[PDB]
Design a protein around this ligand. Structure first.
Ligand SMILES: Nc1ncnc2c1ncn2[C@@H]1O[C@H](COP(=O)(O)OP(=O)(O)OP(=O)(O)O)[C@@H](O)[C@H]1O
Ligand SMILES: [Mg+2]
Lengths: 73, 61
């Protein structure tokens, strides 16, 4: 299992290690929050996380990094 | 007629007393709940401060 902590994902759309699940939505639909939540949720699951931010606003990328740092992620 | 009033009074008092006994018990549960909640709030407050001090130290790092 690769746990997201989202009951809607981990019950009905399960994501497993070695998988590729796409997160698709409209602008401001909550896509980043779902992905970020997943990385924050792997706190003691011993996985490594990479967050590639292609073409994303510099301030926005900084905000994500700050959020990760506060959590200890 | 006699057997009715007595029953009403018997049943009735069994019930007022019972209701107030339940009140007491709750007065007990709430009393318990209040203590637990208070302790939990203190611990939670402790949580916040402790963890934010940790965050500070990490910032210093
Ligand atoms: N489970 C949730 N509960 C409440 N709010 C949420 C949840 N998930 C996301 N949001 C909110 O939705 C807003 C937009 O979310 P987010 O930026 O994560 O989505 P997005 O699709 O990446 O948007 P963008 O296209 O701007 O990148 C955020 O402010 C976030 O707080
Ligand atoms: Mg986004």
């Amino acid at each position: 299992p690769l746990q997201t902590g989202l009951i809607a994902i981990d019950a009905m759309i399960p994501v497993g290690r070695g998988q590729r699940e796409l997160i698709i939505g409209d602008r401001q639909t909550g896509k980043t929050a779902v992905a970020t939540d997943t990385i924050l949720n792997q706190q003691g699951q011993n996985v490594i996380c990479v967050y590639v931010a292609i073409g994303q606003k510099a301030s926005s990328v900084a905000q994500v990094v700050t959020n990760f740092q506060e959590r200890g992620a | 007629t006699i057997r009715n009033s007595e029953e009403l009074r018997g049943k009735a008092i069994e019930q007022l007393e019972k209701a107030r006994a339940r009140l007491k018990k709750v007065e007990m549960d709430a009393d318990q709940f209040r203590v637990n909640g208070y302790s939990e709030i203190e611990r939670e407050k402790m949580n916040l401060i402790n963890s934010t001090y940790k965050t500070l130290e990490q910032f210093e790092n």
